[PDB]
Ligand binder design. Structure first.
Ligand SMILES: NC(=O)c1ccc[n+]([C@@H]2O[C@H](COP(=O)([O-])OP(=O)(O)OC[C@H]3O[C@@H](n4cnc5c(N)ncnc54)[C@H](OP(=O)(O)O)[C@@H]3O)[C@@H](O)[C@H]2O)c1
Ligand SMILES: NC(=O)c1ccc[n+]([C@@H]2O[C@H](COP(=O)([O-])OP(=O)(O)OC[C@H]3O[C@@H](n4cnc5c(N)ncnc54)[C@H](OP(=O)(O)O)[C@@H]3O)[C@@H](O)[C@H]2O)c1
Lengths: 255, 257
């Protein structure tokens, strides 16, 4: 079946911003339960409000804290969510971190955290989804539209999201025998608290006018409410899309 | 004003003692390079490093060897520092360091992931960073990747995935280093006839790779021969300087992009 009925969703980064809206959207469109992962203690209140909204929208909900930069923490998240809800059908990973800096200034500490958050956590999320998802399940990871760009300053960000496209290719081939669809989604720069800290005033002005459809979103950036319906499609009637990394950005970059 | 030959140029090669890098070392020395700094990792590679150094000297260039495990930023920093202490400058920096792993996604351990990314991604990031800090104006920066970047295939998630960052490092560095005249490229051979290839591949896969390129009947084994990769690297670091910001596949017609 290609609806949300009886489906259990796990969302890494599901407490706020894009993931918190996915949680509300999939619940409201009929999902059975949403396992809501969050990382920082400052995100807990949003995680609990997201859980309450999921319940009001008709689904069960539970929250799970973890730092997902270790393989064991990812395994434990899947184990704990499956223990709570009995199965996992749809696994969506929004975990990420941005850095914008000249290549010659990027420290080892910055490299290490960028790759642990954007590459390693995504690898083990894909691994553990392969070990835990029900047959015919869904696996989606968030990347960046900068994978289609030719631009300075994002070496550690663009470079640490790049593995996900290739993880998605391999997992699509390896998990397809069980009916699982595996995709990666790259929004344009989005109007969320994730975007602004890395971007000076000139850069923000550029990003806000760089998409063909910029005049028609709220700020000129990608709005999360225009990303969630595509994720909903991929995990329902868009199941035949697999092994692809797709850019949803208002006409910002292409590939 | 730049010169587009190897005359007076100092070359640093990570993994320069054997296989592809050792042939690059001999080729660039034979075509007129001033000096080659030959990096190697394992003690088992030391004899080949010194043999390569002697061959570089016979070809007319100075040569020195440098052992290092390049999975930490400090070791990459020190490699460039030591090469500069010996030769005074670095003009051409070529990184061949890598590691292959082929296995199902659900079988890859944390230790295997960690080493694959340290060797294929982290070492390459810091090589590109330190080349940005050390290369002479008009210099050259080349990193080896894999033609699997153009493939849609199972079992290489940790290998294809850990070489993928290099394509994007190469884009950013091309843009940032171009102001100093530096050209930055990545080169992805097909599966090559070297000891790196065989241990990870089952016999069935070896036979497939040997027939998978349009020009397979015309190489020595059907795989990519290192002798057909080195002239392209020589081109990129000489008269092909206008190629920058690109990841190019050299594979006999195996994958495309
Ligand atoms: N916003 C944009 O401009 C933009 C553009 C293109 C793509 N994207 C991608 O879209 C995704 C969602 O972005 P968003 O705008 O919704 O912002 P966001 O809420 O800040 O998304 C990042 C998420 O990653 C989590 N995270 C960071 N370090 C972690 C760790 N060690 N372990 C586990 N989780 C960790 C964050 O948790 P805490 O905050 O609680 O630490 C947060 O939940 C990200 O992957 C981002 O790269 C964003
Ligand atoms: N051979 C192929 O089938 C193939 C195909 C496509 C692309 N490539 C790429 O081409 C490049 C050269 O391959 P090759 O065939 O010439 O084989 P190779 O000689 O085995 O090249 C790999 C090099 O990486 C070094 N290395 C490994 N771990 C290291 C570490 N921790 N620190 C520093 N150096 C380290 C190895 O040194 P030690 O051996 O001394 O440890 C060796 O010098 C690699 O990047 C590979 O990924 C190869």
């Amino acid at each position: 079946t290609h609806t949300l009925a009886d489906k259990v969703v796990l969302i890494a980064g599901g407490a706020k911003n894009l993931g918190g809206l996915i949680a509300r959207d999939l619940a409201g469109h009929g999902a059975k339960a949403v396992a809501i992962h969050y990382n920082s203690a400052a995100s807990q209140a949003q995680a609990e409000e997201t859980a309450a909204a999921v319940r009001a929208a008709g689904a069960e909900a539970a929250t799970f804290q973890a730092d997902l930069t270790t393989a064991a923490a990812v395994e434990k998240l899947f184990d704990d969510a499956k223990q709570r809800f009995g199965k996992i059908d749809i696994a969506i990973n929004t975990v990420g971190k941005v850095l914008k800096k000249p290549f010659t200034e990027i420290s080892e500490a910055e490299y290490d955290e960028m790759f642990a958050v954007n590459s390693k956590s995504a690898f083990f999320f894909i691994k553990e989804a392969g070990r835990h998802l029900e047959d015919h399940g869904k696996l989606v990871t968030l990347v960046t539209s900068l994978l289609g760009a030719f631009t300075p300053f994002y070496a550690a960000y663009e470079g640490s999201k790049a593995p996900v496209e290739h993880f998605t290719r391999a997992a699509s081939k390896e998990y397809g025998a069980r009916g699982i669809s595996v995709t990666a989604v790259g929004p344009g720069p989005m109007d969320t608290p994730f975007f602004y800290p890395a971007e000076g005033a000139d850069a923000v002005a550029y990003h806000k006018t760089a998409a063909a459809l910029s005049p028609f979103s709220k700020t000129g950036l990608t709005d999360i409410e225009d990303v969630v319906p595509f994720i909903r499609h991929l995990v329902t009637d868009g199941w035949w899309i697999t092994g692809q990394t797709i850019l949803i950005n208002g006409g910002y970059t292409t590939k």
